[PDB]
């Protein structure tokens, strides 16, 4: 059933698009000390999943923050400074976010190729006999 | 999924540290020692700290 392929590729593109938006929010918040919720932003990472047990779609089961410590900065005159003058910043790593941007885009585009190629197979089956 | 977070810039405060003091030898030149302000009113007539 090549229609099941469209579900797997379609679920893959959804998963890769979630990771790209997560990467976008990490780059936009690599220097954000404050937040709406009173807790410092932590680098986010969507968790992919596979229900292997034929076609196994990839599903996003939630966003999980990185456990690395928040990068402390010595800013004693800052209004949000603690007793020792340290302000805490997100633990976003620039190099690892660029790799995620490259990986998410390439993984997104290769699933379009599979969906397009699988589309041709179904159309060719419609021509069988006739 | 909680994946979209925006960031906007803001001005949380000002650097209230003592500035650079310039010696001019002028009778009408004064500077605040440490922390303080001078009460002035602008053209509108509203008190403000300068």
């Amino acid at each position: 059933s090549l229609f099941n392929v469209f579900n797997v590729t379609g679920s893959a593109m959804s998963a890769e698009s979630v990771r790209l938006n997560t990467t976008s929010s990490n780059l936009a918040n690599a220097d954000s000390v404050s937040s709406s919720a009173k807790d410092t932003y932590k680098a986010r990472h969507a968790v992919f999943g596979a229900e292997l047990s034929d076609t196994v779609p990839v599903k996003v089961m939630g966003i999980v923050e990185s456990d690395k410590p928040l990068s402390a900065e010595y800013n004693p005159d800052h209004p949000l400074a603690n007793e020792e003058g340290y302000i805490y910043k997100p633990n976003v790593n620039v190099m690892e976010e660029m790799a995620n941007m490259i990986s998410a885009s390439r993984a997104y585009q290769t699933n379009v190729q599979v969906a397009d190629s699988s589309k041709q197979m179904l159309l060719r089956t419609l021509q069988m006999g006739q | 999924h909680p994946s979209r977070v925006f960031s906007m810039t803001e001005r949380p405060g000002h650097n209230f540290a003592q500035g650079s003091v310039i010696t001019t030898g002028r009778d009408l030149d004064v500077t605040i020692e440490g922390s303080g302000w001078i009460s002035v009113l602008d053209h509108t007539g509203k008190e403000g700290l300068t």
Binding site: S36, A37 | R4, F6, M8
Partner: peptide
Amino acid sequence: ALSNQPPADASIPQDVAQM
């Protein structure tokens, strides 16, 4: 996931308290 009730608009407030 086809529901029967239109999804609510997302909110992006400055403070979650005033939301």
